[PDB]
Amino acid sequence: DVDECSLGANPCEHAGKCINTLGSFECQCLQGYTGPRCEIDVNECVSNPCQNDATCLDQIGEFQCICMPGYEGVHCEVNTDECASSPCLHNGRCLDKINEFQCECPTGFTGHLCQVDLHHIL
Ligand SMILES: *[C@@H]1O[C@@H](C)[C@@H](O)[C@@H](O[C@@H]2O[C@H](CO)[C@@H](O)[C@H](O)[C@H]2NC(C)=O)[C@@H]1O
Ligand SMILES: [Ca+2]
Ligand SMILES: [Ca+2]
Ligand SMILES: [Ca+2]
Ligand SMILES: [Ca+2]
């Protein structure tokens, strides 16, 4: 038997661990690498995991998503609820939009956040 792991170069790419066998050898790849000699950098973005026009970053053994405004989550799958912080004053009804909200103000109030009092005028 030749020990392929004790020759001039590591036959395993991308710093994989070479393990000798009788008649051959095997490679124990680092996370994110595949192939008999760990030749391939797995594309973690190949199944399109980043949603809603997010940018997928193909990294070593992982992906990361960069979300379009108004989206969040690991897959950018969550439409951020802009009504969460109760931005509408005076019990205004809050409507969630994309990276935005709308306030439906009660009688006598107006403005994006229902700030303006009109009760005194009438
Ligand atoms: C990575 O981050 C994303 C949030 C986007 O800004 C990406 O650019 C945008 O790509 C989408 C499709 O994925 C496209 O709809 C847009 O035209 C494009 N540019 C902008 C400025 O939105 C970015 O690569
Ligand atoms: Ca061998
Ligand atoms: Ca990768
Ligand atoms: Ca929203
Ligand atoms: Ca606004």
- SS3 of 6, please? helix
- Ligand 4 centre to CA of 69 (Å) is 9
Experimental technique used to determine this entry: X-ray
Residues at the binding site are 21, 24, 41-42, 44, 58-59, 79-80, 82, 96-97
Dig out the tokens for 60 from the structure.
Answer: 């070593």
* Consecutive H or E run containing 28: strand 24-28
Q: How far apart are CA 40 and CA 14, in angstroms?
A: 9
- Measured CA to CA, the distance from residue 32 to residue 122 in angstroms comes to 68
Tell me the C-alpha distance between 32 and 13, whole Å. Answer: 12
Nearest to 24 by CA among 38, 8, 3, 39: 3
Strands (E), 60-106: 62-66, 71-72, 78-79, 93-96, 101-104
For residue 77, the one-letter residue type is E
Domains along the sequence of the chain with CATH: 1-42 (2.10.25.10), 43-80 (2.10.25.10), 81-122 (2.10.25.10)
Do β-strands 55-59 and 62-66 pair in parallel, antiparallel, or remain unpaired? antiparallel
